[model samples]
Target: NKTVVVTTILESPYVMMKKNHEMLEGNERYEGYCVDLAAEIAKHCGFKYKLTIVGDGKYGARDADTKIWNGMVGELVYGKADIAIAPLTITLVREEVIDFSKPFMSLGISIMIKKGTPIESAEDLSKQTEIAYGTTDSGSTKEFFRRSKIAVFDKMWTYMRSAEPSVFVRTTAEGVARVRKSKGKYAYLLESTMNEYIEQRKPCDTMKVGGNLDSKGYGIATPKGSSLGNAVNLAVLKLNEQGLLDKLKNKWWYDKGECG
Candidate 1:
């Protein structure tokens, strides 16, 4: 059996460490939407595989100074992993270094604010320095703002980079904590999927406001020349056609709605 090496991260509802993960071994130690998706892909493609978390726990972004990609993206780019079955966004820059399967789920960047904040949209935040806003340190959300050519987004990015108290955060959890404790002074800009999920959780004090900033989907990634790309793409489309994708989403998203 040819064992494929899969690289991912411990992202909730996507790729999470199991409750009894300590007692489990190999792939059994983790379970989530991506975990199941990886199994399905492996079954469909007829390959046995092992899932390993990214060494740096990053969602993959190139450092401005090092100019080297890190996280799962770096793992695949450097030939350390054969496939990446995670919530990786497909972008032009990533495409230049790797190939992505058709999107498994659709989402967009949206603002997550604690309940009762006066700000309604990105433009609202950009106009004033009173409320602090930021996105994940190294991923599509941050990259979008940094590279966006739009006046509003460009202005917003500029503000985040030069904010007085440092609006940037190392992870989504950090940003969420900031929003929860800022007394409506901090806002987190993240993918709509996560934003919506969090809003339905306990404390129910946060809400996604306004429409999404942009539209995109999450795709399974592979190295640029990997042969698994075509097989994985077909598998995703097949799952979508057969309704497995929707079923899995409902299983993880609404049915398990904790804060509902």
Candidate 2:
């Protein structure tokens, strides 16, 4: 039997390196919501798998000029991995190139600010220049702003696109870090799921503010026409119906929450 190669990211509470990862090997080196979900998917689908962190540490995005896909999506597209089991969003552009299982978890684009920031919504961020804001580079959140037509978002995209010093970050952690250290000058636009999880972690100096700007979901992805897609998709639905998905959420997001 061929051991499936699963590509994921190192985002906290979704997939994290265990503290003793240096002393461990293979899948034992990591744990989190996605790690657990991967185990369940493999178990139900009856496959052994090797978990690999994405080499470039990106979610996935296609370059406009080069038309090249990068990150976990690229890994699958280029035959570097069998399936992507990270917090990969399902979008129409991406769906055209690859295949996504039905979404396993729903989320929305959201705002994260340092505690006590006056901004409440995207409008607030857009109307002011004193507080700079940005999204992770090359991910769907950036694409959301790039593609929006609404007045507020259009204006925001304008500022972000041409903002001096390049507001985009390479990773969600970088965006969050900027917020934490910017003396209230920086806010990060990211998914609500990651934002909420960070709000509960230690040294909790950040909080998710305002309603989500849009709705979407994270889906397990595979290369186009992969044999694993059908079984993996079915496993997600079954886990959801059996309450396993909800349980995993509570377990990772709240059960071990560091901040009170």
Candidate 3:
């Protein structure tokens, strides 16, 4: 059987609907960064692929309420996907359950802050009023921040938990919009990939600030015992060595950075 890769829809130019909606099925939408990286894997491993989206958008996280795999990892655990090449984060809990490829893209949790805000860094912002920061509850962005031992974030979290007119959003998009509408009062914490994409987009006014806070990144995921796991890991390493990954990052993202 040819390899089957699974991904999920996210805001473009990472993942999104094509103008011709009829064309995408299964994982055709996975053909960008996720797939470009996947192609490198196929080049090295000599495999063809079939792409599929998850039945649900979650990345196999326990719902915090329902407690089940609701994402590709869940699908893999349930024998639904052969490989997952989305921006699936590598985490300790996830590693215990599913094997991941070598780190493909190493970036930290970052923020998209509207320029007019009084905040400069996590330190400067943590002591403010009204302006609030939060992250996507389901993903690694929150996990990194919550897990950090850094002083700035530790102080910031304390402020967030008891702040007036509380600041929390279920997704990064919602938090970004709140920042735009509130005139720099709302800052979004998300993956550097998504944050950089948003920076080059419409309104083009938002900027990533204070550098990145955490030091981990995304990896391709495979079922724990799958043969595909070793091959994918090697492929990612080769891309890094050959600079193909850097080329792709420039081709899709940096070229379009100036205008949304």
Residue-pair clashes per candidate: 0, 0, 2
**lDDT digits (tens) for residues 1-260 of candidate 3:** 56656554454554555566576675454446765676677778888877666776666565567667767778887778888877788999789878898887788877778877666676777677567777775566666666667887877777666666757666557777887897777887777887887788788878888777767877888888988888788888988899988888887688867774
TM-score per prediction, in order, is 0.97, 0.98, 0.87
* Model 1 per-residue lDDT at 108: 96
Which is the better candidate, 1 or 3, if ranked by TM-score? 1
* lDDT of candidates 1 onward, in order: 0.90, 0.94, 0.73
Candidate 1 Cα misplacement greater than 4 A, ranges: none
* Tens digit of per-residue lDDT, candidate 1, span 12-106: 78888888989989999999889999999899889999999999988888888988999999999999999999989999888888899999999
The TM-score obtained by model 2 is 0.98
Pick the lDDT winner: 2
Model 2 lDDT, residue 147, Cα: 93
Q: Which consecutive 10 residues in model 2 have the weakest lDDT in total?
A: 137-146
Which candidate should be chosen as best, given TM-score against the real structure?
Answer: 2
Model 1, C-alpha of 108: deviation from truth (Å): 0.6
Q: What's model 1's lDDT at 252?
A: 76
Better of 2 and 3 by lDDT: 2
Q: Which stretches of candidate 2 lie over 4 Å from their true place?
A: none
